[PDB]
Amino acid sequence: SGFRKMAFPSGKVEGCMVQVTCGTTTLNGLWLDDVVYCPRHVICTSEDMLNPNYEDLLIRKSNHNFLVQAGNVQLRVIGHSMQNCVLKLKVDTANPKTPKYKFVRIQPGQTFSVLACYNGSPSGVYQCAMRPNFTIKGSFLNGSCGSVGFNIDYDCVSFCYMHHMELPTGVHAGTDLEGNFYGPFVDRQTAQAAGTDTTITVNVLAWLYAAVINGDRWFLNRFTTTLNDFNLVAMKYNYEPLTQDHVDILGPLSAQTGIAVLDMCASLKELLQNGMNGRTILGSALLEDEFTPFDVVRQCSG
Amino acid sequence: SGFRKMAFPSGKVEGCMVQVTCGTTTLNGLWLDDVVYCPRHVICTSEDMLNPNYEDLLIRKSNHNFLVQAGNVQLRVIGHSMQNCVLKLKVDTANPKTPKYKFVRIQPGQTFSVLACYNGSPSGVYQCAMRPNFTIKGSFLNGSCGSVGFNIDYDCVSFCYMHHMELPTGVHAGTDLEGNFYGPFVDRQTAQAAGTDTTITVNVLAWLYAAVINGDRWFLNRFTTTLNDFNLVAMKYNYEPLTQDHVDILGPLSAQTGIAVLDMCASLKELLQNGMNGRTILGSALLEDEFTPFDVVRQCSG
Ligand SMILES: *[C@H](S)C(=O)c1cccc(C(=O)OC(C)(C)C)c1
Numbered sequence A, B: 001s002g003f004r005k006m007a008f009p010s011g012k013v014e015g016c017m018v019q020v021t022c023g024t025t026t027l028n029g030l031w032l033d034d035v036v037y038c039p040r041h042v043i044c045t046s047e048d049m050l051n052p053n054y055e056d057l058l059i060r061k062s063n064h065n066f067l068v069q070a071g072n073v074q075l076r077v078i079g080h081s082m083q084n085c086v087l088k089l090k091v092d093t094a095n096p097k098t099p100k101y102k103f104v105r106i107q108p109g110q111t112f113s114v115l116a117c118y119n120g121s122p123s124g125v126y127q128c129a130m131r132p133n134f135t136i137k138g139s140f141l142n143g144s145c146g147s148v149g150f151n152i153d154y155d156c157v158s159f160c161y162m163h164h165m166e167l168p169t170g171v172h173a174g175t176d177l178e179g180n181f182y183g184p185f186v187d188r189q190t191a192q193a194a195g196t197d198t199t200i201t202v203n204v205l206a207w208l209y210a211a212v213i214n215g216d217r218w219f220l221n222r223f224t225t226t227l228n229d230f231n232l233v234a235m236k237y238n239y240e241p242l243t244q245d246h247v248d249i250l251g252p253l254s255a256q257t258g259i260a261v262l263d264m265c266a267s268l269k270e271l272l273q274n275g276m277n278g279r280t281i282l283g284s285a286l287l288e289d290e291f292t293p294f295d296v297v298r299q300c301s302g
C-alpha cells in the first residue's frame, strides 16, 4: 500500500557522473565507455552568450583545454567533437562502471528520474515528467547543468535528458543525449519562455486508478460518459484530449479495479466541475498528472 | 529554482542489498562488512504468527537453514544471532562495497530516503518522514520487508529504518538497525493500529520559507504573532507546538528571506484559519510537512 513519487535507484548513473572544466566554467558530464557527454555551453564565456558561434568557439580549443575529473582521478582527453548542443570528449579510459544503456528521446507526458549533480558529485534523485510544453518542473541550482534524466528497465539505463538551463518561470529545459533540445529553446541568451501548458489527462486517470487500488473511492460514481462528451469537458479545463489509444493503455488498470475507463472519465468530469469539497486523493488536494499508467502499475500491482 | 521531494542517491545502499530465504520465506537483508541484517520474522511460519516465541524458533535453526544471495552469488552463513527484532547473519565474506556507515535512530519529524527492494533487488527510491505517531507513509508491497531507510552525509550512510510491516490504514512500521521498533508496534499478529497523528509545524514553516525562496509570496502579511498566541492556534488545528528551539533552527532561513520566524507564523495562522482560496504553494494545495529545515537549506540555497 501507499503511493509515492518514486525514482529509479540511481547507482548505475552515479558511476557515470564526472566533472568537466573548460576555462573557468565547470559543469557535469556523463562518462560512458570512452566518451564524456556534456553541454556544449561549457566552452562559452560570459560575454559569448548573446549569439555564440559554437563552431568557431570549438575550433579554437584543443584537448588540453578540457579537464575531466572522475572522483579524484583525472581522465586524459584525447579527442573532442560537437553533436548538436552536446560535446563529446573522447578520453583515454573506458569507464569500468558503464551500464547497459540506450539514448532514447521521450514524449511529453512521459516520466523519468533526474540525478541532480554538482561538480560531478550526485546530490539527489527525484522523478519528473516532460510537460506538454517540453519543459520539466525540476529542482536545479547553478552548477547542475549536465545532470541527466533516465529510466531503467531490466538493468539497461535509457538516458533521455541532459540539463541545460532554467527559464524565467523557474521551469527547466534541456536536450536529449544527442544534443537536440526538447522544445523551442536554444542555448543562447534570449527572452525565450515556456509556452502555454496543459494537464496530462491520461496520467490523471492513471492516478485515480492508483487511488482506487489504494482505497480512496469517494470520487467514484455510477455514471458513465462518452469519449466525445468527456473531451468537450477536457477542452474546457485545459486538459489534453483523451484518445482511444489512451483508453486502451488504461485497460489493465480498468480490469484490475473493475472500473471502466469511461466510468472513470465521468468521475474526473465531476471532479473538474465540482472540485474536491475539502477531501484529498492519495494525500493530494489537486489532480496529479505526473504518473503514467506504467508508473502506477509498477508501483501498485497486487 | 524548483522544489521537489528529493531522495539521496541510492547507489551506496544498492550495493548492500541481498536476499535472505528461510524455509519458504524470502525477504531483503542489508550486508555490511561480514554481517547480514534482516527482520527476524524471516524465521516464522504463517501459523507461527499469533504469539511466536522467537528465541525458541531460532534455537531450532542452523546456519544452513539461511540462504543468502547477493546478486547471483551465494554467501555462506557461518553464524546467526538475534538482536531485538532483527537477525544478524554472519557470512564468510565481507561486502567489498560496504560504505562508511552508522546506525542512527531518528526522531519523529525527521526525514530519510527509502530504497524499496524485492528479492534483494532495488526497485525505487523515495523520501519519507517519521510521523509524530512513529509510522511512515511509505510505498511498499509484499516482499519489501528488510528494505531500509537512510540519510547520507559526506559519503557516510546513516541507516535509520528497516521495514517490517503495514498497519491497517496502509501506513508502515519498522525498526531501527538495532531491531528496536519505532512506536508501540510488535512483530506479531494483533489489532495494532496507528495512533492519532499531528502535523509537524516546524517543517511546514520550513516549506513556507522554501516557497518564498522560490518566489511564492502571496501568503505573506505585515502581521506578526507571539509564540504563545501561535501555539494556541496550532493546538486548535492539530499541529505540534512550536518551541524556541524550532525558532532557532529556522534562523538561517529567516535570515536568508528577511522574514522573521514569528512573522511567518502569522502567515501560517492565516492559512490555517482561511485556507488557500484556490491558490497553491510550491505546486501543492495543502500545507506540506515532510521537509525539514535542513532539507530546505540543502535543496534551495542561493
Ligand atoms: C550550464 S547548466 C549550461 O549548460 C548552460 C546551457 C545552456 C545555456 C546556459 C545559459 O545560458 O546560462 C546563463 C546563466 C543563462 C548565462 C547554460
Ligand SMILES: *[C@H](S)C(=O)c1cccc(C(=O)OC(C)(C)C)c1
Pocket: B027, B039, B040, B041, B042, B049, B143, B144, B145, B146, B163, B164, B165, B186, B187, B188, B189
Ligand atoms: C516481512 S516485510 C516482515 O518482516 C514482517 C515483519 C513483521 C511482521 C510481519 C507480519 O506480521 O506479516 C503478516 C503478513 C501480517 C503475517 C512481517
